[PDB]
Design a protein around this ligand. Structure first.
Ligand SMILES: *Cc1cc2c(cc1C)nc1c(=O)[nH]c(=O)nc-1n2C[C@H](O)[C@H](O)[C@H](O)COP(=O)(O)OP(=O)(O)OC[C@H]1O[C@@H](n2cnc3c(N)ncnc32)[C@H](O)[C@@H]1O
Ligand SMILES: *[C@@H]1O[C@H](CO)[C@@H](O[C@@H]2O[C@H](CO)[C@@H](O)[C@H](O)[C@H]2NC(C)=O)[C@H](O)[C@H]1NC(C)=O
Ligand SMILES: *[C@@H]1O[C@H](CO)[C@@H](O)[C@H](O)[C@H]1NC(C)=O
Ligand SMILES: *[C@@H]1O[C@H](CO)[C@@H](O)[C@H](O)[C@H]1NC(C)=O
Ligand SMILES: [Cl-]
Length: 477
């Protein structure tokens, strides 16, 4: 109905809740998101100042038979900040509180907070850290319910795994604290938007063991495709050996030629060269152009380098954005990559890429480390024993080309086939969800054998399906 907006806006007006609809003059300014390939088209946007107003917005959505959709800082690569067109979007910006409990060492952050100010408050107040995504403007809540693997996650774990309590407002306005060990908390670790509006969240915190830490580059230049594949398999072997500490981090670009990457080291700075020596020795046997450059930085200066100048600003900086389409696969330590699989990946993606209307953007992050003690059943998003996080992407120079998606999906299909051929099952990463997958595909790749349990929790907490608000929302059984 094309007067649905009118009934909703009058419902919200009567509840004292600031809101806009597409006849408001600020509609354009309030419908902005990071992903430019998709166009936001909510039915209305509410701006609750407190939990009572969130409850009143939920009732309004139910009364007009529309879905409810939380809007954080708008970073979703899938457009989920606004969701499927026709939602009542609930803008969470007022929920910006952050507080630290120095007795428990738990940090509490509101449902609309950004990474930068949460980290800076914790660092300035207590000299402590919480693993986080590589963008100070990103929503802490949104990024944490979708995984959030960051540079410190090989030794400190992921943002999602370090949560301990989530304060939910459910579809009927009831507030509940979901604690670690419960079904609602388990479901929120991978599918949090499907169960309610998150008002605040508590997380573990950590003390860095050294004042300074290291950012490095590793470069091997222009290699043959076979030599590039050997190099990746050698990096993998090092990462699985006794020579690689969990305080290491490394991102291997999928941009070749050239072959190179960027990494970090969070152990004792003077140990760096001995940590890297076994890796460099092996890579030198593949190419003499192997070269490592490194810098020692104070803890916070390195954090600003990783996640941007917004780390120092009260809203975490600027949104930015471009037009792109993300694909992403994860693999585990039960299926280390072969030289053939590494070559097929690069041959089909970055080495074949020949568009002049898009610019390729690919990389694979070394996971591993403390993922070794995680089981796929421990959290809704199955990531036990993850070893690689692979992202293959491309951003449009202008508008996104009509054949871009089919071109990009065909690029990496041979690699997917090769993973299956060697006996792996295809897996994904929620924050890098692939908008083009069927339900059978994304449910298998994100939730594998947790999916049936996830749907039973969904019926318990959202029987009306009010929060079935994006393409990969958990359905009712
Ligand atoms: C823009 C961006 C994203 C990003 C990144 C760097 C930048 C510049 N770096 C990342 C990284 O290093 N690692 C990673 O895993 N992801 C990274 N991202 C992606 C980002 O984490 C995800 O896109 C994330 O979903 C963004 O969340 P944010 O909250 O900022 O964005 P949103 O579009 O408005 O909302 C995303 C989804 O989460 C739900 N949500 C958000 N807040 C709530 C609350 N309070 N309650 C319930 N659900 C909530 C939204 O409904 C939507 O589904
Ligand atoms: C590690 O990160 C630092 C901080 O960003 C990099 O230092 C910058 O280096 C460029 C030139 O390479 C200068 O123009 C910047 O002014 C530097 N910034 C600071 C704060 O010093 C450093 O190059 C990185 N080290 C690597 C990649 O090995
Ligand atoms: C670009 O790549 C596509 C995909 O294989 C191919 O069909 C096309 O001929 C290529 N164009 C050029 C100029 O190489
Ligand atoms: C609100 O919904 C939850 C979700 O099932 C339910 O447990 C609770 O009883 C409901 N509360 C009220 C007051 O209806
Ligand atoms: Cl030091």
């Amino acid at each position: 109905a094309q007067n649905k907006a009118d009934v909703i806006s009058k419902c919200l007006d009567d509840a004292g809740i600031r809101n806009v609809i597409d006849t408001d003059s600020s509609w354009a300014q309030e419908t902005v998101m990071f992903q430019k390939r998709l166009k936001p088209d909510p039915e209305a946007i509410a701006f609750p100042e407190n939990s009572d107003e969130v409850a009143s917005a939920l009732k309004c959505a139910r009364e007009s038979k529309v879905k409810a959709n939380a809007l954080g800082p708008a970073h979703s690569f899938q457009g989920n900040g606004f969701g499927i067109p026709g939602n009542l979007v609930i803008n969470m910006a007022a929920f910006d509180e952050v507080s630290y409990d120095k007795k428990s060492t738990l940090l509490t952050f509101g449902g609309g907070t950004h990474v930068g100010p949460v980290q800076k408050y914790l660092w300035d107040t207590a000299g402590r850290h919480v693993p986080h995504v590589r963008g100070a403007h990103v929503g802490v809540t949104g990024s944490s319910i979708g995984g959030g693997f960051g540079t410190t996650s090989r030794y400190l774990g992921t943002p999602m795994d370090n949560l301990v309590e989530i304060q939910y407002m459910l579809y009927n306005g009831t507030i509940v604290n979901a604690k670690k060990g419960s079904d609602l908390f388990w479901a929120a670790q991978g599918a949090g938007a499907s169960f309610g509006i998150i008002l605040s969240t508590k997380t573990k915190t950590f003390k860095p063991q050294f004042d300074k830490a290291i950012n490095f580059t590793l470069s091997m230049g222009d290699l043959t495709p076979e030599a590039g594949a050997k190099a990746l398999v050698a990096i993998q072997d090092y990462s699985l050996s006794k020579d690689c500490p969990d305080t290491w981090a490394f991102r291997w670009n999928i941009m070749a030629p050239p072959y190179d990457g960027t990494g970090y080291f969070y152990g004792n700075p003077s140990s760096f060269d001995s940590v890297m020596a076994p890796l460099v020795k092996k890579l030198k046997t593949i190419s003499s152009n192997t070269a490592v450059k490194s810098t020692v930085l104070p803890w916070w200066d390195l954090e600003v380098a990783v996640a941007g100048p917004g780390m120092n600003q009260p809203n975490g900086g600027a949104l930015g954005g471009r037009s792109f389409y993300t694909q992403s696969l994860t693999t585990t330590t039960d299926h280390p990559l072969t030289v053939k699989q590494a070559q097929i990946l690069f041959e089909g993606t970055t080495l074949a890429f020949n568009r002049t209307d898009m610019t390729k953007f690919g990389y694979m992050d070394l996971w591993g480390g403390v993922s070794r003690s995680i089981k796929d059943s421990d959290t809704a998003y199955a990531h036990g024993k993850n070893l690689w996080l692979i992202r293959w992407d491309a951003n449009a120079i202008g508008a996104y080309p009509s054949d871009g998606i089919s071109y990009m999906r065909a690029s990496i299909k041979p690699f997917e086939d090769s993973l299956v051929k060697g006996g792996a099952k295809l897996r994904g990463f929620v924050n890098y969800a692939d908008t083009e997958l069927t339900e059978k595909e994304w449910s298998s790749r994100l939730y594998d054998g947790n999916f049936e349990r996830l749907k039973q929790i969904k019926a318990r907490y959202d029987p009306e399906g009010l929060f079935i608000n994006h393409r990969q929302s958990i359905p009712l059984p």
